[PDB]
Amino acid sequence: VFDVGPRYTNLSYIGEGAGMVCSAYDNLNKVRVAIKKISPFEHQTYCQRTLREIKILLRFRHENIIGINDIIRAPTIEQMKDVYIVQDLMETDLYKLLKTQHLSNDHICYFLYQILRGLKYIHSANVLHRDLKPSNLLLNTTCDLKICDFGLARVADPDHDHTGFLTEYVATRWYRAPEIMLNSKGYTKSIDIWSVGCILAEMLSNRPIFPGKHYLDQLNHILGILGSPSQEDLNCIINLKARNYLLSLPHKNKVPWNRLFPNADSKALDLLDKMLTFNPHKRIEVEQALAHPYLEQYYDPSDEPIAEAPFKFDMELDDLPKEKLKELIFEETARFQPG
Numbered sequence: 052v053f054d055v056g057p058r059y060t061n062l063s064y065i066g067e068g069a070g071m072v073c074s075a076y077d078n079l080n081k082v083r084v085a086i087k088k089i090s091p092f093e094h095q096t097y098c099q100r101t102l103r104e105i106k107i108l109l110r111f112r113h114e115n116i117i118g119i120n121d122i123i124r125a126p127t128i129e130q131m132k133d134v135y136i137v138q139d140l141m142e143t144d145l146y147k148l149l150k151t152q153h154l155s156n157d158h159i160c161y162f163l164y165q166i167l168r169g170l171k172y173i174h175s176a177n178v179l180h181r182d183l184k185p186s187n188l189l190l191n192t193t194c195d196l197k198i199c200d201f202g203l204a205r206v207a208d209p210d211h212d213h214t215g216f217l218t219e220y221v222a223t224r225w226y227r228a229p230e231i232m233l234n235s236k237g238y239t240k241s242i243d244i245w246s247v248g249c250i251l252a253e254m255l256s257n258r259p260i261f262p263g264k265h266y267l268d269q270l271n272h273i274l275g276i277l278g279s280p281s282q283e284d285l286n287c288i289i290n291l292k293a294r295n296y297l298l299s300l301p302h303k304n305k306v307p308w309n310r311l312f313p314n315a316d317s318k319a320l321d322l323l324d325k326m327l328t329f330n331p332h333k334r335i336e337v338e339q340a341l342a343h344p345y346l347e348q349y350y351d352p353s354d355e356p357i358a359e360a361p362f363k364f365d366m367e368l369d370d371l372p373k374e375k376l377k378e379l380i381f382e383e384t385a386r387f388q389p390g
């Protein structure tokens with residue numbers, strides 16, 4: 052069922068995010084839109100992820116971030132079983148674009164600029180995306196880029212980022228920073244910068260840079276290119292088991308970025324090196340990335356807006372039962388009802 056009519060009709064499948072997305076014709080504004088159907092109410096985790104996505108996207112307004120135009124759901128909590136989020140329809144995504152063509156450096160440069168511009172806004176709101184990858188970067192023929200799919204987004208929590216070695220993780224494997232496998236829950240802004248570095252590498256060659264086939268193979272791929280971490284980075288590794296693991300490995304030299312990407316712009320590779328830095332404390336931050344020489348032609352902090360109302364506190368949804376989370380989702384979606 053895709054109960055969005057009679058207002059939204061002529062449905063066609065698009066894809067799946069972290070729910071199902073369809074395109075539809077809006078019979079009011081006479082334009083095609085995208086609609087995501089979410090059915091989360093039987094599981095507490097799905098309720099938490101839905102509430103976060105809706106709360107975050109309703110607070111955000113930025114050119115490089117997908118917005119929420121409308122939310123469809125039943126008029127009462129008792130009748131509400133699905134929630135439909137209506138968003139701008141784009142023409143394609145970076146995953147699909149990279150399957151069909153090789154991007155020129157000036158397209159890579161402009162797309163990277165837009166990714167970082169949107170991420171500056173997200174980070175300024177104390178929010179983490181946590182699942183940046185090509186299929187979540189939407190494009191149109193005018194080359195406007197919009198970040199979508201905030202299903203795994205969280206309010207940043209650097210003081211509670213610590214976890215053990217080889218801790219299970221939800222976000223897309225190929226775009227996970229090395230610390231996810233060593234000591235991190237992915238609650239700091241540096242997690243998103245790593246993913247952006249992976250995306251830049253992928254635009255440079257049309258291939259994922261670290262295509263791990265399984266959880267620990269992901270770290271194998273990363274260390275295979277970055278080489279063995281320094282003593283100083285091992286001194287920042289926190290966990291006994293992570294430190295022991297890394298010390299046990301044979302020494303691996305770093306693979307020069309210009310050997311992997313012999314035709315890439317040297318300034319793109321310098322920025323790539325700084326985003327794909329092993330130690331998250333030494334990894335470049337979003338504002339620094341925007342100020343890097345590779346993006347000098349677009350850099351303009353006066354035209355790179357920040358959020359008016361950041362999320363100052365943890366949402367504290369961990370102990371709320373799915374029944375309470377449904378009440379909160381109902382309240383958060385009320386503004387879109389006819390009354």
Ligand SMILES: CC(C)Oc1ccc2[nH]nc(-c3ccnc(N4CCOCC4)c3)c2c1
Nearest residue numbers: 066067068072085139140141142143144199
């Ligand atoms: C994760 C993904 C499935 O989520 C979305 C969310 C909002 C969206 N708006 N536009 C898209 C989108 C993404 C990829 N291709 C298209 N097009 C629409 C036009 O016909 C071709 C496919 C549209 C989209 C995807």
